Amino acid sequence: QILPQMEQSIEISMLQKQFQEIKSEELKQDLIRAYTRRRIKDLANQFSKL
Amino acid sequence: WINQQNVNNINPDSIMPATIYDETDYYLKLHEQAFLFEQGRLEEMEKVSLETEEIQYKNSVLMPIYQDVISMIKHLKSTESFKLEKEFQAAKRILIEDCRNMQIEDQLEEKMAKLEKAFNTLRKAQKEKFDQPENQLEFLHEHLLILYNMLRKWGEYTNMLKIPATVVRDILHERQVMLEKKKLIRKQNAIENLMLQFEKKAEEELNAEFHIEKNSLYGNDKNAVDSRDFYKGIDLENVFPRALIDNSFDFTKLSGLPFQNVKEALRNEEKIELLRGEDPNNSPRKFETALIVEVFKLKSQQLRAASLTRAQQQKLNDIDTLLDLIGEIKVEEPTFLLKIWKNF
Amino acid sequence: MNPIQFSQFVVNSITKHYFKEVAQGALRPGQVRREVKSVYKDYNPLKIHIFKYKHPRMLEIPMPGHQRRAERVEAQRRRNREQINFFCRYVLAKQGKTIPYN
Amino acid sequence: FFYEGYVWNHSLNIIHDIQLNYLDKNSNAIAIKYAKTLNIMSSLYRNLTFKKFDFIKIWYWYYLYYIKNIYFKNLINKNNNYVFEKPNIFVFNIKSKQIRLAVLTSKNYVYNLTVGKILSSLNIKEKSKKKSNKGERLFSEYLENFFKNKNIRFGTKKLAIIKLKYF
């Protein structure tokens, strides 16, 4: 419970700052969709466990 | 067609030329394939035709050569004349896009006519620099060494192609033999954990037993030099000369040749000529010529009448050697070479 | 039995019959049945008389005339199946329902 | 002593005298030993001649390289190296409702193996080999003991060509 709620507040604020300097809407929507892939693998490991 | 006349006078060449069973390795492949077809095995039958394991070894020899033959050609094509024609076209695109943007295009035909006139003033004016004995000789001394370096690489590229796979297979016996010599010198001196041991055995055995020569690909793991860590805390100004670095990045000039001099080139053929011929005189290798070797010799005969310095006479004596060498250098498959002259 | 007869056994095997050669020396489990069933599929079971049944009293042979009408009937039985193979799939894709593996 | 010696007769000029006989296909302990020697014969001739093709154009080198590949690659299967050994064969009949198996050993001997010969030893009814709910399994047990004897007739490098006739 406590880790991801602490992580998402971090993992997003580290990105919103990064989206600020950018003004294109192509990169913005690709980093998010890359962030999901890198976060879905986190769940793939959990289901491998018991 | 066969009359009653030519029933008995049938030439076998019209049916079966001599060249196949004499000048070609075709019937050989059938004899291996059928020899094994009776034995039952079928995988090897394919390999006689494909010969994958042998050709892959061959490409490792061919590619680094052919990687080098290109870069010489581009310098042979980067002369002042071609660079002009590249810029002849660049001017045209700049005329029109100005006539477009300025909306003045009716005037173009009167202007484009002036353009082509101007370059013909330049092209003739380009000769008047190269018509000099001074500038003429300086071009040849560099332009030809690049060529002579190329043609001998071309020989290496052509010799390696001719080599049949039977010859290639024997190296892959040597490599199997040379390792075991290097082994005996040394040997004299839960289910998942089992699975891992198979890999490390596979990885190490493969890399040594791998049937292809070392290239830019593999060999980088051996040297323990670590070029980065070697330089940490170094001022490279002191180590490397300030003049080398500047001419290095002068990419228009090629550098790193094997033979940068005439005398080094002559050492090459002499080491070659002894193996080939018991007599370095009267060899049939000398009769070969071109038009281009012989025309420019006549020009060397006309300049040598004119006044010159000592060095310029020494350049004639350098160039006139390279002329005679090139005509004697056997060549091969210019049809395959035409395209390579065009593409690059 | 003889080495001369060996080659005559292998040559006859290639041309008239099927043939493999394993590289690793051993036989993977279930390698036989798959390689057999591939032939059972290439040959139509639905046209060869042996491949319908095992028991010989079903493999007893009628008249040809009595057999042609059987082909008409069984052919029609398939068409009813081939449609319901399409129907139930068609419906499930409309209801959008799912079958959990677990 | 090739250093001090000038032109001399080669010891291998004798071979022109003897009628060389074509080698049979079943010998491969010998074929391999040509290659080990001849690969040395050419290795120096290449490293010295720098792999140049002009020295290979003459016929007998090219004729020889094509002969390495044959005497080098085993003429018997890859799986053997020494000498021919008559691979074994296994043959199942299936149109027999009874299970069967016939062997062609590496020697001339032949096995006739059936469910009955096992069940002849055990004095059971005439009906069980058809259902074979035991005969299927007694056969599987019979095969295990059939190899524990470690018979010679199979061969050192044991081979097999399994076959299935009917459906």
Place this chain on the structure above:
Amino acid sequence: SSIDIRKVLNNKYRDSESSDFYKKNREQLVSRIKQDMDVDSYTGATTRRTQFQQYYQDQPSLGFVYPMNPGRGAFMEPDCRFTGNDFMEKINTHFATAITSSYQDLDKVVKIQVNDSKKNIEQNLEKLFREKNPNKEFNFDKEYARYLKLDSKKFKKEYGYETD
């Protein structure tokens, strides 16, 4: 925006010809264009490949070679001897002359590289015997037999490198 006039003025509305829809009348137009031009100047040479959903389409521009040399016949003409033990008869024809003439030729090349450099051969060996046998005699023709009769192991220890 993104719009010019010259594209409008240079345009001229017309009616459709057969080329726009009908292949044969169109392909007759295409061939009349390709005669003058050469694709390889625009693209060099390559695997001219184009890829639809999962479908490719190839017409590479390569360089073809046909290497041929009269020695490559190997006397292997088809004479019914493709297989059977009659095959190996076809190999053992020249299997005598081919061996012998080879062994003739190493002895030519080896001797020529030894005759031309006997001096260095004499000098390079003696320098090594000194480090092994300092301040002593060196009978070349006698000690040269120890360069050979040694086994591969002992040859390494004295000489530092291995050959046979």
Place this chain on the structure above:
Amino acid sequence: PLYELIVLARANTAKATTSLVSSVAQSILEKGGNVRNTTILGDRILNRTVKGNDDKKHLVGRYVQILYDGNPQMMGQIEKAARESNEGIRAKTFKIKDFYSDAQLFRRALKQTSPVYPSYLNDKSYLHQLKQIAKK
């Protein structure tokens, strides 16, 4: 009319085939008829054993063409000749019309220009005239 002939031929040197053709070519002309070409398809491994005239097994075979214009009553005796010969094993006849079409010709016409062939056979004036007659 024009009938194409095909043969299984035991692969031998060029002499055995020329003997085979020269025998067949006279068997036709002895009766009447012509012969339009004599060519060769290719040697390959055969999928199945074959008995020749030697009561011998074979797995390698040579295909041949013998195009001829002749009677339909004559073809049968020609099939026997090949099947009776020593080089030939099997035979069969055909009837065709793609002969003297485009693709059956241009491949046959650029046949001379193959690098595998020699050069003394290449007569370039032949192809030049062969073009100018083969044009629409």
Place this chain on the structure above:
Amino acid sequence: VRNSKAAQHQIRSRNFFEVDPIFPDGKD
């Protein structure tokens, strides 16, 4: 030949008509 395809010259390259586009971009 390994890759054979018949020239269906009856087929016409340009559609003489319009259609609702299948795979549009945006929502215009």
Place this chain on the structure above:
Amino acid sequence: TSEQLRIKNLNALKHELKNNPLFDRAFPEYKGKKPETTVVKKQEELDFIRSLGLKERINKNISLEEAEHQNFKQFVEGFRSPSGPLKYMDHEEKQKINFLIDQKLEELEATGLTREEILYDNPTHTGLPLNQDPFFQYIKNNYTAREVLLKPGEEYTVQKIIDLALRQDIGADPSQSAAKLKNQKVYHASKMGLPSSRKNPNAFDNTSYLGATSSTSEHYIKELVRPDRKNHEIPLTKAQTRKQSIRKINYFDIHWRNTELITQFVNNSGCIKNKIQNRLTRPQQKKIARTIRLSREMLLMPFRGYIKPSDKKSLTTLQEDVENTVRTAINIETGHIYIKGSVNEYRNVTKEFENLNDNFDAKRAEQSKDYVIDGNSQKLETTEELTLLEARMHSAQLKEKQLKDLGVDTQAIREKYQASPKNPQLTIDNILSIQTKQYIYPPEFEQLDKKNQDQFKESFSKFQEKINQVPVDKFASLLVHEKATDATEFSNKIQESDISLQESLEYVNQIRSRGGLSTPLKI
């Protein structure tokens, strides 16, 4: 700026010598001023945010012949080239090349043709005109996009850029958003029926060209985990499955002597398929069944056993059976060989025919008839390009005199090493004299008639004048064409002009001043 040039070149090597694992092939100009040097990668943890902007090392299965040319292209291609790598390339030279591209792209749009037609002379399908193709237009109008896929250590040429335009060989999207899909098979465009057919899930996908498209839940659920729910898709009617999967074949390419086609319609076991599994109509499935049942009987193709690649080899004359063994195929980009079966090796029979010369003098070539360097020539030489040979002949005849003036016995060598065109059958007695007689020489200039001596002289006189008119710079290019007897470059002609040089350069450099190009000319 001269001070800056050093600040660049000094720091340039710092960038290279840290990042190039292959500096020796890059700058082999010096070897002893440094050891043999490489660069080594090391494992690293990764920030959970910053690495999102990274890209993958590979999307595909790469063969060995590609890896060398890719690493070579990565580092050494530009370091050895004249213009240099794209990294340290000036704006002016990049701008010059950019005009020549634009001058070529519009010539293609001027035709109104499509992409596939320009490349292919018997195209299966035809796509878009280039006025409408977005990719081609995107390249034409933006210069930076030309440089993206071109690697930094690569050369910036015209040909490489036009390749992307006329063929979009780009692979998958190696974003960290895409899904790495495993099964991606790529069949030929003749096995297809209607292009509207459903999407093979097993085979290659169009979604891989952009990760933002394959960023759907279905793709992430596929590769990263296992499924738990069976999701049903709508099926097709038995009619619609066929109608999508109809194939059509030329009736004339049906004959039994072409197994490349016929074996496509038989199972692995060797049993004929139905029309449906064959993807065919009724009559075309008849005309093939006759050919199989006939080709089974001529023993090209088996009755009952497994199909073999030897059986897949279509039949034809010895030449196309023999040459295809002798025919080794090489890329001109890359010297490696294509293994047989790994490439479509191409030949238009009709074009080679029509490409021949409609003008020919057989008498004029009788001199050079016996003389030949290559095996045979598929070319029917012109009058001009015949003169080049007769001058090559004159040249080799001159050096025989040059050597004979120094004492060489010319007749002695021509008896030992001269190779006749007609060579009889090879035997144990004939092979040593003929393998020594490999060389092909001209005849003596002495043993000739005057007209045979005149033509070899006059032929030499023509080309001697042209090379005087041709400048000196392109020495080698003439020598490349001089072998293969191409006379185009030899055909040069400069026209007169009344304009002065000052009027010229003042006019040209003025023009170039508008597009950039502050650097004037110097001739």
